[PDB]
Amino acid sequence: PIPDMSKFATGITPFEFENMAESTGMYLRIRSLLKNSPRNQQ
Amino acid sequence: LSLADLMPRVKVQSVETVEGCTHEVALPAEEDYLPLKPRVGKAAKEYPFILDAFQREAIQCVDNNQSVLVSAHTSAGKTVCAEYAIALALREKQRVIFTSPIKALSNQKYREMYEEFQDVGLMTGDVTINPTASCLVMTTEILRSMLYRGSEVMREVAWVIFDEIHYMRDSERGVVWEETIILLPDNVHYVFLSATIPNARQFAEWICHLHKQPCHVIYTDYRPTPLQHYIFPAGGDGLHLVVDENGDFREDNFNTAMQVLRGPSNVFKIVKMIMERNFQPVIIFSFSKKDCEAYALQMTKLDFNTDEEKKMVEEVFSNAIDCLSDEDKKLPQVEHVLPLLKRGIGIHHGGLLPILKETIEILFSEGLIKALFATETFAMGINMPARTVLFTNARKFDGKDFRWISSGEYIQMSGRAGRRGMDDRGIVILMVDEKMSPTIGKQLLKGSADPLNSAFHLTYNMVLNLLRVEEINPEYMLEKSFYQFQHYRAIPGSRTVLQMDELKCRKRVLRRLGFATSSDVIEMKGRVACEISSADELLLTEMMFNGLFNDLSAEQATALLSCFVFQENSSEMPKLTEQLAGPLRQMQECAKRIAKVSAEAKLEIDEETYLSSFKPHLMDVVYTWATGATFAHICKMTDVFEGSIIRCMRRLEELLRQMCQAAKAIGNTELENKFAEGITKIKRDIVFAASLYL
Numbered sequence: 259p260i261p262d263m264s265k266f267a268t269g270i271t272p273f274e275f276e277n278m279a280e281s282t283g284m285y286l287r288i289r290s291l292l293k294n295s296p297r298n299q300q
Numbered sequence: 301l302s303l304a305d306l307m308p309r310v311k312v313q314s315v316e317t318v319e320g321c322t323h324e325v326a327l328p329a330e331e332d333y334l335p336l337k338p339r340v341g342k343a344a345k346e347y348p349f350i351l352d353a354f355q356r357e358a359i360q361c362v363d364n365n366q367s368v369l370v371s372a373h374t375s376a377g378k379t380v381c382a383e384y385a386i387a388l389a390l391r392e393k394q395r396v397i398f399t400s401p402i403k404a405l406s407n408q409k410y411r412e413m414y415e416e417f418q419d420v421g422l423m424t425g426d427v428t429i430n431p432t433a434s435c436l437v438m439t440t441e442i443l444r445s446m447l448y449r450g451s452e453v454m455r456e457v458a459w460v461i462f463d464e465i466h467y468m469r470d471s472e473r474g475v476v477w478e479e480t481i482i483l484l485p486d487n488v489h490y491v492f493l494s495a496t497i498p499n500a501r502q503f504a505e506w507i508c509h510l511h512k513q514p515c516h517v518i519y520t521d522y523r524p525t526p527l528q529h530y531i532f533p534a535g536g537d538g539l540h541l542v543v544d545e546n547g548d549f550r551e552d553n554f555n556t557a558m559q560v561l562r563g564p565s566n567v568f569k570i571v572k573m574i575m576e577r578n579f580q581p582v583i584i585f586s587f588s589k590k591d592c593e594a595y596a597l598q599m600t601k602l603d604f605n606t607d608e609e610k611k612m613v614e615e616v617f618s619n620a621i622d623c624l625s626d627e628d629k630k631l632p633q634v635e636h637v638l639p640l641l642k643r644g645i646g647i648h649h650g651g652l653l654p655i656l657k658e659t660i661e662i663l664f665s666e667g668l669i670k671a672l673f674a675t676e677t678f679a680m681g682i683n684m685p686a687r688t689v690l691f692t693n694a695r696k697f698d699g700k701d702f703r704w705i706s707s708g709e710y711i712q713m714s715g716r717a718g719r720r721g722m723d724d725r726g727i728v729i730l731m732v733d734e735k736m737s738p739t740i741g742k743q744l745l746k747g748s749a750d751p752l753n754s755a756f757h758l759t760y761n762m763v764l765n766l767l768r769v770e771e772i773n774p775e776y777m778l779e780k781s782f783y784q785f786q787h788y789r790a791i792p793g794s795r796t797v798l799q800m801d802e803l804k805c806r807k808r809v810l811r812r813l814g815f816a817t818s819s820d821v822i823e824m825k826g827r828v829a830c831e832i833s834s835a836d837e838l839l840l841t842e843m844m845f846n847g848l849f850n851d852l853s854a855e856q857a858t859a860l861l862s863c864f865v866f867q868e869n870s871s872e873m874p875k876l877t878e879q880l881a882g883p884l885r886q887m888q889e890c891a892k893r894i895a896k897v898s899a900e901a902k903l904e905i906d907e908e909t910y911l912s913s914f915k916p917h918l919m920d921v922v923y924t925w926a927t928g929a930t931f932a933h934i935c936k937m938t939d940v941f942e943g944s945i946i947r948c949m950r951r952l953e954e955l956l957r958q959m960c961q962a963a964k965a966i967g968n969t970e971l972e973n974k975f976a977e978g979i980t981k982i983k984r985d986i987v988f989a990a991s992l993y994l
């Protein structure tokens with residue numbers, strides 16, 4: 259029923275991987291500060 | 301009158317299970333029901349706890365490679381089922397997609413899944429990470445874009461997981477959501493995760509009708525932590541139990557609560573009572589950003605944190621904003637929240653700087669915030685429950701009238717009480733400031749969740765893209781929408797295909813304006829509209845082809861485009877220099893003509909209303925931002941919340957990317973470079989600071 263993906267791709271600009279990035283390490287840095295929090299102790 | 305040629309042929313089979321969950325399966329009526337078979341091989345994933353009955357049942361569906369809707373309370377552990385599908389997909393060297401309705405939630409889910417599977421990526425309208433990952437977390441808008449563009453990323457996808465499908469309507473992604481389900485190939489299988497909904501069977505029947513395969517329904521009302529519901533009448537001194545652990549309404553205590561009748565200070569009293577009784581952590585739900593900030597500031601007399609907890613807050617807070625520039629660290633909102641957080645008092649609403657909202661989420665999720673004053677959106681956050689949930693008001697305003705909150709809203713918010721493991725009970729407290737009957741009180745506190753109803757409607761981008769693609773047409777998506785399926789089931793025997801009249805009128809507009817030929821073949825102008833989804837694709841393309849953007853600088857165009865993504869209905873109009881009021885008048889003239897064409901095409905539309913939807917209250921804010929001002933500066937130019945400014949800026953950046961693709965579709969490198977320059981001029985600093993979850 260649904261045409262193949264190739265038919266959706268013809269006649270339109272392709273999908274682009276926009277706003278590329280890499281892990282800032284922020285979360286794991288914040289996580290280390292929270293070793294003995296009320297939730298980590300319980 | 302347009303009658304359907306082929307109607308749904310679906311039957312539902314009940315499947316007996318051990319106590320504690322319901323199992324049904326919708327399947328093609330012509331096929332024989334085949335029970336599921338035991339897992340062949342090892343479990344794709346193992347857990348360090350005993351799975352509940354409904355989880356085992358859902359997991360067996362995945363082991364048999366059959367789609368499943370899991371409808372259960374948030375807290376029952378639906379994510380376990382998604383984790384098994386991801387694990388199985390990676391073991392089989394397949395790709396799997398996990399979609400959320402909101403970008404903020406996708407960021408949280410990316411962290412959760414990355415910490416569990418590592419081989420995870422993220423794709424939103426604000427960031428792309430590890431796009432070759434086996435497991436891709438993304439928003440439903442991204443998935444729609446990949447499908448309409450035939451992205452090869454979809455060829456290896458074996459499983460798609462839709463999270464929180466009951467929230468798609470409120471999230472604004474109601475149409476996008478059904479489009480992705482309708483456009484996915486039939487070889488893909490699904491895990492739908494939903495809150496408890498009364499029409500789960502209906503949804504599975506639709507999926508079965510759509511993809512000609514069985515779709516299971518695993519449903520349970522199970523709550524690992526039982527709740528107790530109290531009413532705190534205005535002026536009263538204590539709490540009145542109105543629904544006990546077993547779900548029995550207490551009509552005696554209810555009237556006794558109304559007896560006390562027959563609110564800043566009241567909020568402080570009740571909160572203080574909660575803290576003295578060790579009912580914290582507490583989430584205080586208010587349906588207004590301002591109420592959240594006011595109530596929070598009334599708690600400044602109190603201090604909930606230990607010295608060791610203050611240090612943790614301070615350290616986390618400084619590490620979080622350390623990514624900001626020294627100019628943005630000094631923003632008033634930044635300096636205003638930290639004294640609260642140190643005292644265990646938090647705030648969470650859309651008006652907040654995203655970096656602070658994420659900081660507050662992480663703090664509350666780790667127990668460093670004992671009293672969080674939040675709007676309804678916080679209930680959709682992942683793994684952030686409390687011991688107590690407090691409702692400051694039983695009524696809200698849905699842009700129409702003061703109505704009591706629905707049972708579904710109460711269930712969604714009240715369901716964040718009760719932390720599994722450390723709470724034996726969950727406490728829910730409903731503040732009531734006026735008279736209310738036992739009937740509606742029982743409906744509110746004991747009524748069932750709201751049904752999941754289709755939000756599908758036609759859009760020009762949808763119609764044009766389906767005209768464009770060969771071997772499919774707009775009529776196909778209409779007949780296969782859940783909106784159409786709900787009609788079939790609500791009125792048995794009816795074959796009328798709804799929305800056809802609207803489809804014809806909308807195509808007349810497209811013809812009369814050169815988007816498509818009389819024979820419904822798409823023009824190059826239409827292919828430009830196919831690139832624009834987040835805003836009025838018709839008007840923006842007409843503006844492009846009339847040249848409105850050619851005489852504008854990047855800053856002017858960027859500022860003018862803010863009128864297409866700004867959505868606040870209670871702001872004061874600023875004064876615009878001719879550099880902005882000029883382009884604004886050109887856009888409005890064009891909008892008038894489209895309104896005229898639409899009316900003549902026999903679409904219901906009001907010219908003034910249509911012109912009013914393009915709100916220019918931030919044109920100057922955006923213009924000055926694009927010309928290099930600081931965020932602190934532009935906040936002084938408006939009463940709009942800082943977080944609402946950033947939300948508009950982020951949707952503006954998303955629209956600009958679509959305008960680049962629009963110009964690119966006709967090789968108009970002039971506008972492409974112009975729209976791209978606007979992006980470069982707004983994508984900086986706290987407004988586009990990275991998510992703390994990355």
Ligand SMILES: Nc1ncnc2c1ncn2[C@@H]1O[C@H](COP(=O)(O)OP(=O)(O)O)[C@@H](O)[C@H]1O
Binds near residue numbers: 350351355380
């Ligand atoms: N069967 C279970 N037994 C014990 N704990 C569970 C079970 N299922 C889930 N959990 C835990 O409960 C917490 C919340 O579950 P979650 O998956 O967020 O529920 P949902 O996402 O369906 O609301 C998680 O910390 C999870 O580890």
Ligand SMILES: [Mg+2]
Binds near residue numbers: 497498748749
């Ligand atoms: Mg029911």
Ligand SMILES: [Mg+2]
Binds near residue numbers: 766767768769770774
């Ligand atoms: Mg077509």
